[PDB]
Amino acid sequence: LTIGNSTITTQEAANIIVGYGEWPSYCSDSDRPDVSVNRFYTLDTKLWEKSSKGWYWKFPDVLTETGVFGQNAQFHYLYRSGFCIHVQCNASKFHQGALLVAVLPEYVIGTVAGGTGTEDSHPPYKQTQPGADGFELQHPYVLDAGIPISQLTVCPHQWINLRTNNCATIIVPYINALPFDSALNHCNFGLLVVPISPLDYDQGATPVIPITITLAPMCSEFAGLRQ
Amino acid sequence: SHSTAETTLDSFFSRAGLVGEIDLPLEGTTNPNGYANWDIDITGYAQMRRKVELFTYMRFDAEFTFVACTPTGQVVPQLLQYMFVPPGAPKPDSRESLAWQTATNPSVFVKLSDPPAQVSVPFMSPASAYQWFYDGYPTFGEHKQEKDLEYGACPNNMMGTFSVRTVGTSKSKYPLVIRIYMRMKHVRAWIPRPMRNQNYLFKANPNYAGNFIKPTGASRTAITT
Amino acid sequence: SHSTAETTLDSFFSRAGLVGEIDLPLEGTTNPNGYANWDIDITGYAQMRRKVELFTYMRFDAEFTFVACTPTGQVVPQLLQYMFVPPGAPKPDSRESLAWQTATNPSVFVKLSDPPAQVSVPFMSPASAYQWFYDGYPTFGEHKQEKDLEYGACPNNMMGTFSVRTVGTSKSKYPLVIRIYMRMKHVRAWIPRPMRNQNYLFKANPNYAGNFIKPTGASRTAITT
Amino acid sequence: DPPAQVSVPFMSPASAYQWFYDGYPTFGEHKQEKDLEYGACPNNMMGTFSVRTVGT
Amino acid sequence: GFPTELKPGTNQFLTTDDGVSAPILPNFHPTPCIHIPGEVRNLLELCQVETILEVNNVPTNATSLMERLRFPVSAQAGKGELCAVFRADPGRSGPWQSTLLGQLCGYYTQWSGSLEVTFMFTGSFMATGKMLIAYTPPGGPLPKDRATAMLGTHVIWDFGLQSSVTLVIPWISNTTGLVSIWYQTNYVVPIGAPNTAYIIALAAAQKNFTMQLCKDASDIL
Amino acid sequence: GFPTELKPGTNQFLTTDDGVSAPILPNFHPTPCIHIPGEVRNLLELCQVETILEVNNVPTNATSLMERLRFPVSAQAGKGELCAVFRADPGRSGPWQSTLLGQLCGYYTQWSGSLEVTFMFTGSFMATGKMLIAYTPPGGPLPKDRATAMLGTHVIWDFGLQSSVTLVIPWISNTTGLVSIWYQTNYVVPIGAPNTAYIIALAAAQKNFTMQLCKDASDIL
C-alpha cells in the first residue's frame, strides 16, 4: 500500500474509548475521490536527545508543504478532517520514563519582555516558517503560552504508564465556531509534549529513544467546495 | 445530594461590584476640551477580567444605572439624558462633528426622583458572539501580508460609547462623582479554560517579566513535619 | 430563511433622534415680543426628510415629551402646562388675540417629578392622509387662473402649533434649553419612490444649481486594475 | 421613593446561630493553645457595612 | 395605602421605549381604510429591483454626461482587459454606493447573501464568436493567466442564447474572492459593419439576504 | 386617580436586585442558537478534574524549575519519613491553593465532602516489596509509632496491581484528622539497577461536595 520499505501499522485490535457518547460523525443538516486519501505515509525519523524539552507544530501549517494535496490546497482554504494519533515508545527492560500528551485548542502565542527595557520587535521572516526545525523553549512554566503546566488537566489528556502497556491512542473531536469557517485563517489546534522522567540509564543500554508521530484520518471526508 | 433548593445557582453568579469611575473636571490638562468618551472596555481592569476569562462563548444584553452625588453624600437636582451611537458609526473626535445632530439614534430620558432607571440594549455586533481569545490575525480582510492604516485603534471589536452633554445655554459649574456597577443577565459557557495566576504587565497583552514568582513558600522545609 | 425571530421588523424602523430645538431668549431682536410659535414642519430639515421621503401615503398620531435643563445639566423646579389650538382656527399674531382665552380647547397638565409624560393627539386634518408630493396646483378652489390673497402662508396643510406662557404675575427670569425627539407609531406605505442624492438649495423646493456633482470618483482610471 | 425594603440571605457557614455554648468556642484541632486572633473573632457575627459620601 | 417598591432608573430617558397614550378626543372617528385589490405588506419588494453599475468614473465634463451609463468596446484592442470590478462590498466605496442595498447598509454592519450576474449580447446579425464570463472562487488570487481562470466556475455564453444564462455565487460575507473580465476573443467584422459595440450587464441578489446588527452610523453628510 | 401606598426604601440601591428592561429596538433579531451534538449545562464538570499537589516548595532557583513537579526518593534513607501532608484545608495556605476548588472557596466559608487518593507504582521489573498507605482517623494524634497507624484504616498496596486501589475518607468539614506517610520498607535493588525512583500521587473529591454560605471576600490581591 506504501511505495517503499515501510508499511508499519498499529495492529487491528485497538481499544477505542468514546467520550461522552459524542463520537465524530457527519453533519449533513440543512440549517468522487476516495482512492488517494486512504493511503498513509510515514513521516521521517527523528533522534531524541537528553537536552530536548519538547516541540510544537501549527496545524494544518505543516501539511501545506509536506503533502502532495498540500501544495494545490494553498489557494483552496477549505479543509475538514478528523485525525487519529498513535503514540508508542520503543524501550527495553533497562529504561524508565513517563509521557504526558494532550491537545490544547487555540494555542495562543505570547511574546516575552526581557532586558532593561520592556519593548519587543517584530518577529523575523525566517522564523515565520521554521519547518521541521521548529523553535526552542525559553521559559517552560508557560510553554510560550502563559499557562502553568499543572493545570492543563482541564483538557482531554492521557497518562503513559510503561508498567503494563507501551502504545496508547487518543481520539479528539473536530470543533468549530461556525458551520462554515476558513481553515487557513483560523488555527485549528496544536500538539504539546512534556518530559516527566529525565533520561536515565546505565552503560551498555541504548542512549537514544525513537519518537513516533502517526497521522491517520479515522473519519473520511467528502470535501470539495469554494470557501 | 438530598435537597438542592438552598443550593440554587442564583447566588453562584449574581454579584454587583464597582467597575468604572468617570470624572468631569471643570478645568484640566489631560482633558481640556470639556468632554470625554468612555468605551466599554472590560479588559481594562485585571480584577474583573479574572472572573470573565473563565468564559469563552457568550452573548448577552446590558443593564446600567447612573448615580451622581457629592463626596459628602448631599443630593442635588440635576437632570441628564443619555444618547447612544451605534458601534458601526465612527466616534466623534472634535466638537464640530455631526454625531451630536443625529436624530436617527434612539434615546430614553428618565428623571432622578423616579425609581432607579432600568435600561437594556440589544446585541448589535455583526459577529455571532464575543471572542476573548483569537489564535491568529484579528483582521478579517483578504490582505494577509500588509497592515491596515487604522492599526492600533480598532473600534470594530467593542460595542460603542456614550456622549454626555449638559442642558442649558451655559456650561455646568459643578463637577460630579459617578460610579458604575456591572452584571450578567444570562450565563452560558461552552469551553472551560484555566484562569490567570501571576500578575499582568501590559493592559492588552498577558506578557510577563524575568522575575518569576511562586504560588507559596509557607513550608520552611519539606523534610521535616 | 430558517428563523425570523431575531430579524423582527421592530428594530428596522424605531430610532429616536434630535429633531427640533426651541430657544427662549430673555431679550432679543429677532423675537423682541417674548413669545414664539413653532409649527410642526417636518420638511424644515434635510436630514430627517430623507427618511420620510421614501413614504407617500401615511396617517398617524404623535407622541411628544418635553425636557428643560441648563447647559451644566442642573435641574430646576419649574412647571409648565401646554395648550393646543386646532389647525382650523388661525394662529395668533399679536398678544391681544383671543387665542389665549379660548376655553373650548382641551389641555392636559403634568408635572416633572412624575414619570415622563406620554401624550397623544388624533388626526384632525380634513384630508384622508398627508401628501408630500402634488403634481399640480395645491389650492382646492374653483378659481384656476388667479391666486389667493394668502399666497405663501398656507397653514391649511400643516397640523397647527403650541402656545407657551409662564405661570406667575411677573415674567420668568430664566432661559431654558429644550430638545425634542420624533418617532412614528404605525408604519404603512404604498407607492415606493427613490430618495434624494444631491443636496438641497431651498427649503421648500428641490431645485439645484449649475455645479453638478458625481456620486464617486475613487477609481483613478477604469482602464487599469 | 417609598421606604426601602431590602433583604439579605443567611450566609453564615453554620446551620443556625447559637447564643450559648457549653464549651470552647474555637473549632480547631488544637485544644491546649490559643489563637493569635483571640478577642477579635468576626467568625461569629454577620459582617458590617461601609459608608462613603458621593462627591469630589 | 398600597405598598409599592421604587425601581432604580426613574428619570432616565430611553430612546427605544415604545409608548402609547390615550387620545384627547375619543369621539372623532379617523377616516376609513381604503380597500385596494392589490396589497403589499413587506419591504421585500425592493430586493428584486435591478440597478445598473458603471466603472468609467473618470470623465467629469458636462457635455459627456450621457455616455457615462455605458462603457464602449472596440476591435482595436486585442486580448487586453475589459473591466476590473473592485472588491464586492456595499459598505465600501465603489459602484455599490449608488445601489439601494448599499444605502440601506449605511446604518448596519454585517451582511450575507448570494450574487447573480446576467449578460445579453447585442452584436451584428452575421458575426460569429464565443464569450465567456467566469467568477474566481475565494482563495484564488487575481488571475494572471486564463488557466487560473478556468479552474474556477465558468459558464459558456453562446450568441444564439441572449440572457437565459444565470451565474450564482453561493455565499458572500465580511477575505473574499475576486472577479475579473478579460477579452475572450476579439470581435471582428467584415467591411460594411460598425467597428464599435456596447455591452449591458445586470446584477441582483437572491432571497437569502439577511441582517443581524444595527449601527448608529449616518453617512449624510 | 388610583390610590397607592408608598413603601419605605424607595431611593435605596440594591446590589442583589435582578431587573429586566424592554429592548430599545424590537425589530432586530439576535443570531440563532448554534446546535451542537454534545451539550453541557452544569458546573459539575470541574469537580472530577485531577490536580497535582507538591510538597517540596523549598527551592526557588531558575534552573531547578522542572524538578518541582515531583519529589525524589532514594534507597540511602532507611525507615525515615517520606512526606508530611499539612492539615487538609483548601481555605488555608499550603498545597491546596493551586487547586481549582480552593480558589472557588475564596468567596465562600463552609465546605464538606469526601476525599480519595490514588497511587501507582513505577519501580523496576525485578523488584519485590510491599507499600502501605494509611490515613489516620480523627481524634488520633500524629502517629508516633506504626502501631498507632495500624489501628486506623489501611489499604494493602501490591506491586502487581498499579492503580485500582481506592481509599475514601467518609467526611471532612471545618478539629480533624491527620495523614502521614512513612517508609513502609526500603526499596532495594541489585547491581545494574538505578538507585533512585519517583512516585506519583493523585487526589480528587466525590459527588458529595456542597456549598452553603457565600462570603464577600476577595483574595486578589
F168 and F206 in contact (C-beta within 8 Å)? yes
Q: Which of F12, F110, F215 lies nearest to residue D6, judging by beta carbons? A: F12
User: Distance between CA D56 and CA B78 in Å, rounded?
Assistant: 16
> Over the range C24-44, which residues count as b (16 or more CB within 10 Å of their CB) and which as e?
beeeeeeeeeeeeeeebeeee
- Residue holding cell 412647571? C79
Cβ count within 10 A of residue C104 = 6
State how far the Cα of C141 lies from the Cα of C58, in Å rounded to an integer: 24
- Torsion, Cα E136 E141 E147 E150, to 10 degrees, reads -10
Whether omega before B25 lies within 30 degrees of 0, making that bond cis, reads no
Which amino acid would we find at residue B139? T
Q: CA-to-CA distance for A208 and F197, rounded, in angstroms?
A: 20
DSSP count for chain E of H helices, then E strands: 2, 8
Cβ neighbours of E90 (radius 10 Å): 20
User: C159, C40 in Cβ contact below 8 A?
Assistant: yes
Deposited experimental method = cryo-EM
Encode burial over E196-220: b for 16+ CB neighbours within 10 A, e otherwise.
ebebebebebeeebebbbbbbbbee
Q: Which three cell numbers stand for residue C169?
A: 404675575
Q: Is C152 helix (H, G, I), strand (E, B) or coil?
A: coil
Q: Is C11 on the interface with B (CB under 8 A)?
A: yes
- The residues facing A87 across adjacent strands are A168
DSSP conformation class of E23? B
Question: Cα–Cα distances in Å, from F142 out to F87, F90, F95, F115?
Answer: 11, 20, 19, 19
- Between CA A208 and CA E31 the distance in angstroms is 96
Question: Alpha-carbon dihedral of residues B149, B152, B157, B160, nearest 10 degrees?
Answer: -100
Are the C-beta atoms of C92 and C100 separated by less than 8 Å? yes
What amino acid occupies position A16?
I
Bridge partners of residue F133, in order along the sequence: F155
Enter the C-alpha cell of residue A75: 489557494
CB contact under 8 A, E108 and B79: no
A155 in Cβ contact with B195 (< 8 Å): no
Name the one residue in this structure whose C-alpha cell is 428594530: C11
Give the residue among C50, C128, C129, C35 at the shortest CA–CA distance from C83.
Answer: C35
Q: Is the Cα dihedral C135, C139, C140, C145 positive or negative? A: negative
Residue with cell 506491586: F159
In terms of Cα–Cα distance, which of C38, C42, C35 is closest to C19?
A: C42
Strands (E), chain F: 72-74, 111-120, 131-135, 153-157, 167-172, 196-198, 200-205, 210-211
Residues in Cβ contact with F161 at an 8 Å cutoff, skipping those fewer than 6 apart: none
Backbone angles phi, psi at B42, to 5 degrees: -65, -35
Q: Cis ω on the peptide bond leading into residue F221 (within 30° of 0)? A: yes
Query: Distance between CA C125 and CA B166 in Å, rounded?
Result: 38
What DSSP string runs through A120-145? --PPPSGGG--TTS----S-TTTTTT
Q: Name the 3-class secondary structure at C118.
A: coil
- Grid look-up 513516533 returns A212
Which residues, in sequence order, are bridge partners of residue A214? A86
Backbone breaks in chain E (C–N > 2.5 Å) follow which residues? 174
* Cα Rg, chain F, nearest whole Å: 26
Q: Which DSSP letter does residue E181 get?
A: B
* Cα distance between residue B2 and residue E21, in whole Å: 53
Beta strands A84-88 and E196-198: pairing type? Answer: unpaired
Cell numbers of F169, please?
475518607
Beta-sheet pairing, A214-216 with A84-88: antiparallel
Residue whose entry in the numeric block shows the C-alpha cell 506504626:
F146
Beta carbons within 10 angstroms of residue F21's beta carbon: 22
For residue E132, give the amino acid letter: L
d(CA A69, CA A181): 20
Please check whether residue C17 touches F, CB under 8 A: no
**Torsion angle in degrees (nearest 10) through CA of B198, B202, B206, B209:** -60
Retrieve residue F170's grid coordinates.
Answer: 467518609
**Cβ contacts of F95 within 8 Å, gap of 6 or more:** F53, F54, F55, F85, F86
d(CA C45, CA A172) in angstroms, rounded, equals: 62
Half-sphere exposure at residue A18, Cβ-oriented, CA atoms within 13 angstroms = 7
Residue F159 grid coordinates? 506491586
- Verify whether the Cβ–Cβ distance F220 to B212 is below 8 Å: no
Q: What are phi and psi of E160, to 5 degrees?
A: -80, -25
Q: How far apart are CA E197 and CA E77, in angstroms?
A: 13
Residue A195: is it exposed, middle or buried by C-beta count within 10 angstroms (0-12/13-18/19+)? middle
* Cell numbers for E1: 395605602
CA-based radius of gyration for chain A: 20
Distance CA B9, CA F18 (A): 14
DSSP, res E149: H
* Residue C196 contacts residue C53 (beta carbons within 8 Å): yes
Give E162-165 contacts, CB < 8 A, sequence gap 24+: E162/E120, E162/E121, E163/E118, E163/E119, E163/E120, E163/E202, E165/E118, E165/E119
List the single best residue of E5, E7, E10, E11 to mutate versus D (max D Cβ within 10 A).
E5
- CB of A75 within 8 Å of a chain E CB? The answer is yes
Whole-number Cα distances in Å, C101 to B23, C95, C124, C165: 50, 11, 22, 12
Q: Report yes or no: F149 and F176 within 8 Å, Cβ to Cβ.
A: no
Tell me the three cell numbers of residue E138.
475565494
Cell numbers that stand for C93 in this block: 399674531
Alpha-carbon gap, residue E20 to E41, rounded angstroms: 23
The sign one gets for the Cα dihedral B83, B84, B89, B95 is positive
From residue A98, alpha-carbon distances to A152, E37, F206 in Å are: 17, 82, 27
Q: C188 — alpha (psi -120 to 50), left (phi > 0) or beta?
A: beta
Q: Specify the pairing of strand C119-121 against strand C62-64.
A: antiparallel
Q: Which triple of cell numbers denotes residue D49?
A: 457595612
List chains adjacent to chain F, taking adjacency as at least 3 C-beta pairs closer than 8 Å: A, B, C, D, E
Query: What span, in angstroms and rounded, lies between the C-alpha atoms of D47 and F160?
Result: 55
Helices (H), A136-205: none
Cβ-based neighbours of A88, under 8 Å, separated by 6 or more: A10, A166, A167, A168, A212
Most F CBs within 10 Å, among E4, E12, E15, E104, to test the F interface: E4
Q: Which three cell numbers stand for residue B87?
A: 458601534
Q: Take residue F135 and report the three cell numbers written for it.
A: 490515613
Give the burial string for B156-182 (b: 16+ CB within 10 Å, else e): eebbbbebbbbbbeeebebebbbbebb
| Touching, B vs A (3+ Cβ pairs under 8 A) | yes
Three-class DSSP category at F214: strand
Q: Where are the alpha helices (DSSP H) in F42-134?
A: 100-104
Name the region of C52 (left: φ>0; alpha: ψ -120 to 50; beta: rest): alpha
Give every CB contact of residue A39 below 8 A, 6+ residues apart in sequence: A1, A2
The C-alpha cell at A199 is 533520561
Chain centre distance of CA A174: 14
Provide the 3-class DSSP secondary structure of residue C68.
strand
Q: Is B215 on the interface with D (CB under 8 A)?
A: no
Residue E3 identity (one-letter amino acid): P
- Identify whether the C-beta of residue A33 lies closer than 8 Å to the C-beta of residue A167: no
Query: Residue F204: which of F124, F100, F57 has the closest Cα?
Result: F100
Count Cβ atoms below 10 Å from residue E134 Cβ, excluding itself: 20
Tell me which H or E stretch contains B28: none
Neighbours of B29 (CB within 10 A): 6
Q: Please give the Cα distance from E199 to E120 (Å, whole number).
A: 7
Beta-bridge partner residues of E172: E113
User: Which residue in F109, F72, F48, F101 sits closest to F194, CA to CA?
Assistant: F72
Q: Is the bond preceding residue A47 a cis peptide, omega within 30 degrees?
A: no
Among residues 136-175 of chain E, which lie with CB inside 8 Å of chain C?
142
**E 81-140 residues with CB below 8 A of C?**
81, 83-84, 86, 93-94, 97-98, 103
Report DSSP state, residue E106.
G
For residue E154, give the DSSP letter: E
**Sign of the dihedral defined by the CA atoms of residues F79, F83, F86, F88, in that order:** negative
Cα E170 from Cα E114, distance rounded (Å): 5
With an 8 Å Cβ cutoff, are F198 and A163 in contact? no
**Residues 6+ positions from D2 with CB-CB distance below 8 Å:** E3, E4, E5, E6, F5, F6, F7, F8, F9, F10
Radius of gyration for the alpha carbons in chain C, expressed in angstroms and rounded? 22
**Cell for F124?**
523496576
Contact check, Cβ <8 Å, B103/C181: yes
Q: List, as one string, the DSSP characters of A50-89.
A: TT------BTTTTHHHHSHHHHHTSS--------EEEEE-
**Phi/psi of residue E66, each to 5°?**
-75, -30
Query: Is A96 in contact with F70 (Cβ distance < 8 A)?
Result: no
Chain E residue with Cα closest to C188 = E41
Cβ–Cβ under 8 Å, residues F189 and F127: yes
Instruction: Judge whether B30 and B154 are in contact, CB under 8 Å.
Output: no
